[PDB]
Design a protein around this ligand. Structure first.
Ligand code: JH4
Ligand code: CL
Ligand code: MG
Ligand code: MG
Ligand code: MG
Ligand code: MG
Lengths: 194, 194
């Protein structure tokens, strides 16, 4: 019933462009929308986010998170490890790669979502969410070696899964970080379960 | 260590603007970024709210209430938590309850309210509060509820058992061409992973 009529470029950077979308509303009336897209999509999705489940025996199961300065935010954010999927990379491989570069952990794929939207009232950005377990007891994850890209500077934060939401709230109150919305959602559902 | 040096307006619509962001990296080097912001954000603590609406009824499994809308930036229909921007001088809780009733017809009761969390912090500064709300589906007010949506709003309500959220979302992805929001998918995965 609704669909896109045309997309007018307003402005195009190296990474991000702004368009004005014309669309047919369900009443038969033409309407416009200001839309953001990345200029880098190729790929099933722009990116991947990894839910990394750090499993070490006789320890609480942890969820591995990253903290970075996010220039659009103008401060530091706590997020699942993530990046853009390389041209002709699979989502699963972007996930393991990004997870390694950002945290140094070597993990195994548990499952992989379809492409899901990040902020669909604003942008077309999508990601695959990739659940990955990390055998914290293998020698390769003993002193995990984070190999960041150029211009990435990432702190690694492992929080117990069974207390994640309370832990995140503690971090925000005590540290002025912003928690990612997907991370916060995950944490909520851990509490809302059962 | 890192911080914003300056912010240069590249392009401004009625709703979104693109900015060139200059910042100090942790080595001491000046770098730039292409940042998106909304033009609508006054003194609200976040741009918007997303509502996690738990529909509770005697001798029913709990249901998560979701909305399906056409999203111009995506060129298609998306399944998402009920959500809208926070009006000037409105609290996140009021906005959450208002949007939920507007988009679904349900009158909920506040349960909890997150801090401001970031939507896509590598791309935008956009933030929401995620507001958890319980819906007493035994109250007569919530029996045959009508969405009273705004101008340009055309929303379908979809209620899914919390206990089978992830598969029910998958079954919808398999049946039509549509995208699940990443916050919704994160929540559904954590329900599974608990
Ligand atoms: C974020 N873009 C937007 N918002 C409202 C109406 C039109 N475009
Ligand atoms: Cl798992
Ligand atoms: Mg990254
Ligand atoms: Mg990286
Ligand atoms: Mg809305
Ligand atoms: Mg609305």
């Amino acid at each position: 019933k609704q669909y896109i009529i045309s997309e007018e470029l307003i402005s195009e950077g190296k990474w991000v462009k702004l368009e004005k979308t014309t669309y047919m509303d369900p009443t038969g009336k033409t309407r416009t929308w200001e839309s953001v897209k990345r200029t880098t999509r190729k790929q099933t999705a722009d990116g991947v986010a990894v839910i990394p489940v750090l499993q070490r025996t006789l320890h609480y199961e942890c969820i591995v998170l990253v903290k970075q300065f996010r220039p659009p935010m103008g401060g530091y954010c706590i997020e699942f490890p993530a990046g853009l999927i390389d041209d002709g990379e699979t989502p699963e491989a972007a996930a393991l790669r990004e997870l390694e570069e950002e945290t140094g952990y070597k993990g195994d794929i548990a499952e992989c979502s379809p492409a899901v939207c990040m902020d669909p009232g604003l942008s077309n950005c999508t990601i695959h969410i990739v659940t990955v377990t990390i055998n914290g007891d293998d020698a390769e994850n003993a002193r995990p070696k984070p190999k960041p890209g150029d211009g990435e500077f990432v702190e690694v934060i492992s929080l117990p899964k069974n207390d994640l939401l309370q832990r995140l709230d503690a971090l925000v109150a005590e540290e002025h970080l912003t928690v990612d919305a997907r991370v916060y959602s995950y944490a909520l559902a851990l509490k809302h379960a059962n």
